[PDB]
Amino acid sequence: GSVVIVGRIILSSITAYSQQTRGLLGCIITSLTGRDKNQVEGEVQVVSTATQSFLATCVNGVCWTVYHGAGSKTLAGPKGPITQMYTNVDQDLVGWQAPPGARSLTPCTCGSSDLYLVTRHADVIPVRRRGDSRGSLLSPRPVSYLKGSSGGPLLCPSGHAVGIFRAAVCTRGVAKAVDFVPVESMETTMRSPVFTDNSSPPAVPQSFQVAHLHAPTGSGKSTKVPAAYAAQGYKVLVLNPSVAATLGFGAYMSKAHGIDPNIRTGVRTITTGAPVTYSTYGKFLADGGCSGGAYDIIICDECHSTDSTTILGIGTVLDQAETAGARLVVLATATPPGSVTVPHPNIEEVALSNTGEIPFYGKAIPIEAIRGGRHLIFCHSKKKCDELAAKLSGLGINAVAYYRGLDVSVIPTIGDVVVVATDALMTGYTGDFDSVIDCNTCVTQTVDFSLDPTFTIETTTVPQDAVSRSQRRGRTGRGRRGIYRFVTPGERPSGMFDSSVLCECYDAGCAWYELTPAETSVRLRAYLNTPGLPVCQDHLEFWESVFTGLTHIDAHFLSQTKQAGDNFPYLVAYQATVCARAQAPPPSWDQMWKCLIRLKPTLHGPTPLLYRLGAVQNEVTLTHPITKYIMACMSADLEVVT
Amino acid sequence: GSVVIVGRIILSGSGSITAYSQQTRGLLGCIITSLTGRDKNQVEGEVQVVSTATQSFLATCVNGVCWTVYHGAGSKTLAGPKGPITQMYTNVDQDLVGWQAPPGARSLTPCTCGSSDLYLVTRHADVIPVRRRGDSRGSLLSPRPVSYLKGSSGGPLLCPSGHAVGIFRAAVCTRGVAKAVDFVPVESMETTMRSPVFTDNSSPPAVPQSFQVAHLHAPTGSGKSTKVPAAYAAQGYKVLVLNPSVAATLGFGAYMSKAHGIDPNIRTGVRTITTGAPVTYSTYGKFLADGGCSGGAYDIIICDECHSTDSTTILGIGTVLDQAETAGARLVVLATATPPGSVTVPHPNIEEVALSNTGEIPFYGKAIPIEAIRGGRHLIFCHSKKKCDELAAKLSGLGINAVAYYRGLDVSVIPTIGDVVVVATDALMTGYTGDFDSVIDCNTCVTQTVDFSLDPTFTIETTTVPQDAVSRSQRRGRTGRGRRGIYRFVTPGERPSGMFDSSVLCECYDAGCAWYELTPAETSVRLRAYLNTPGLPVCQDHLEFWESVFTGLTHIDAHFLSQTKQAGDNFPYLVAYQATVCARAQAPPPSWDQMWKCLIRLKPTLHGPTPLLYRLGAVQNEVTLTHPITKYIMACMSADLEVVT
């Protein structure tokens, strides 16, 4: 679907009123055709996707809005879908060429500090500017008041535009200030390349640089280019999110480039003396980051990956590499932020229909599509993998489930098979398939600052984004002609990640890498300070403050949550430690709390609840000092998108 | 709009009960089908996935009827092969509606085992074990977060043989965790099917020999509050007529003394009169203030506008129903033009016209042209006091006599008489009795809703929402009275009538404590009688919860409470009680919103965090949760709470 104009905010000796020009049906049809002929009028449009409504503001002949609302979508237009003229993920800013009829606001120059924000309800909220991109509300408002107003203008008294509203800054759910994208970031954006060539690995600079490398897998970004640098005499570390991929580089590089490299993973180390080393991010973090003077070049492969181990790992590289004598960090990926999936010449993509014997996410798979050959079906959950593999086995189709916690030997590697997998596949197993059948959904964790009493870390199912679709689809088509079958053409915006992943970084710092909360922050700051990598909200101080108060964890409980391999081992074992020491029960008896089972006979009363990591079945008390500490941390300024 | 079938859940016909879903329609297909009401797709399966524009849920075919919940479907039609299918059954009381199953659908059939091992089928085609605990209740073997069950109301509960025991309607939650399920029992369905599809309530009942409650569903103008009390009194009975509105109460009395001969007793705050006549007109408020039913005083009590869901009406009606028999009454009449499940139908005297984007006056994303309102007398419903002042101002700039009216302002600012454009909230309807040349309707209203947010306790939120069939009918009713009338509207959307939020129950306890010297237990008796009475508006049974909350709110500061009562805002007791806890701790209120104005004079002595009891608005100050009352209300949140799914 295209983004679709559904109304406009008409400005005036500053007043505002709204007009709605389209209902739900109009909006849906136009989104799908991308053809919109209605008259366009005004500086501020009210726009909508199928999932969301927000604002867009025309400036210098460009219709600007927020990346978090529009992603990389086309805008419905009179001559059809209008491709974005500008996509600046780093600034949460996108732009379309304004169609005829749209009027622009002119940049505010005088440089006033009394500002006015125009909401989707056509209120005019006075704001006092502070920095380049922040303004304090004269009258604090509940945050819900600003939702749907992303993209709306911040105006000076003359009525010229300072920027566009992008996010509220909250204290316990009350918007005290607002974050905006200034008009100078728009101008900068208007002068950036039509297409920057990033497909060429850079030459080694005289002094430290950070370079991007955008190219497909099979391009040789992780094999050909390290070899080339090695031939020139450089030492080079290659970092990858997958244990299986990393191990795979050793036999491949020996055979293909006559280099038997150093290989480093949690489960296996090989030191050959070679000038090229492949390592996982996790093992790099375990080894303590950059070895003094060891490498000239660090290639951060699959740098689009937004698991916490990758984020902290790259952040560590960016904080440590220059000081460690390296000359060149390369952030390499085939799918950078803002990317969209395009047709692949070697992959035929066919939508599932309802015809077929095997039900699948509301559609159907014909048995003939999978009866023989080697096929991969991506499901969002363990449980769905188990049920579908059972169904297929019951029909006598050779089928196996793969997900985190299973050994990869469940395979086979050769012969007919239907592999029914989660995304754990993309790191546990390197092979390709004759076809991929994709549910087009995934599980992700999201933080909710729920104040009940503190925060909640929630597991949710969401539509895949352009990175998930392209990486799932890419398990077919490499050196064979492939087929990609799908439930829905949907595709969320690529390149953004949740604050709960930042929380996981501090968790893993504490649990695995002996990092103090403050050292994790330094490394993440270096990542946050780096354009062209995936984007998140700036919640470093908030999470640092939470983990800073979590002292004297019980070593034993921690070792058990680590061994068990589930998410947030530090927060889980830290809750367990509070419970055990207060002689009180855990929030429930789900397997998350199993390190406490031996104490079940003696644990009683309400749970000293710190935070919510699942269902809370027991009664809760709020009297524990740590709970009070974590509640005070909730008063921190928090960016939240509107 | 029609309900639309967008998928189905297929159940295994052998072995252990399993299921899978099939999606049959996209979003675009769903909206088009809901607009036309014409659904070509053949149906299959017994469990359908259904959707309106605002939500998705399930319906289960049992015995040739496709059943679902009223909280999901309201009174809507079902998109069908030959056009919209009207509901055969609309059982608001049971949260059960039914449409005749169209060709294609199979039906499940009721169980015969009587087994207590049940299986709930969800919209994601999970099959969840449940242990039957009573007629309409089952316990989950594995408690689940409540969000897991949302969108699954209308789903079947199955016995092990795959037959139907009932349909799922609500989760019973404990602090956000579903532990049990509430369902409509299959025997309720069977009874319904063996009973009349149409029942007569169009005429006032004969006075029975012994106590009865009867419904009177009759249009306005049929003289529910004039003709029918008069007719009964003409037979020699004593009649009490209760109405929410002072203005209507006084208007009816005056009308009777002029047109029906009799000078009746009048009972209101502003005007009370004892003539000794056998007809008495009173507000529900004055009735409660007098202490309810005065023994042996009336033979018949007409509870008029009994569709109203303000808390005074509910508490008043509950009182009459708890007390009338004992006080010696023969008949209670529950009278309304718009009973629950009713729908707005066309009216001959009133021409209805969509508002467009053409016109000089912006209005709720559309426009009013000055042509439409420059001559004559018109009424424009706005949702908020704020927008009434900004439209009246924007209208009076263009040489238009525009008077805004809302709660707080006084009637008699409304020209009688002259050319005029009253711009008003729904306060207009309890305040003023006059009609207009036209009505322009924003089709939205402001309501209160409770969220069991546990942050730390509950939140009462003020939200703007689309109007219901009652609000539409009543706003439109201010024109076309015995003459030509025009009704202009921003939107044709009309949400389901006759339901009310748990926040109103809260408000009943608040009002009992604030105004009528009722203990929470006493209020519970009156509300129970209301909840036990079919055909009246419906709500969730949160009575033990709310009674438990107010039971701990003891020793309120009387001065604060007298100030919040006189100020006239909602929840005077909960506001004054938070204010009380604040002052006694010398702590500030949660914010300096007008809500907390009774504390402004103390501003210079109040310091530290607010001992927060609950959320009634934005909380700007730091908070502490150590107050014993906060701890008490937190304990109360452990109550078993029905929440719909």
Ligand SMILES: CC[C@@H]([NH2+][C@@H](C)CC(=O)NCC[NH3+])c1ccc(Cl)c(Oc2ccccc2)c1F
């Ligand atoms: C404009 C601010 C920016 N966040 C900064 C912390 C920079 C950053 O993301 N650094 C990471 C390294 N490249 C930002 C940019 C884009 C978006 Cl979409 C932002 O908002 C969200 C919102 C929700 C989830 C993720 C990002 C954003 F804050």
Ligand SMILES: CC[C@@H]([NH2+][C@@H](C)CC(=O)NCC[NH3+])c1ccc(Cl)c(Oc2ccccc2)c1F
């Ligand atoms: C089936 C339960 C029923 N509630 C009972 C307390 C009966 C009742 O409402 N009595 C009031 C006087 N007649 C019930 C019926 C219909 C609906 Cl829609 C129910 O659920 C809601 C949900 C949200 C808001 C209002 C009603 C409901 F519980």
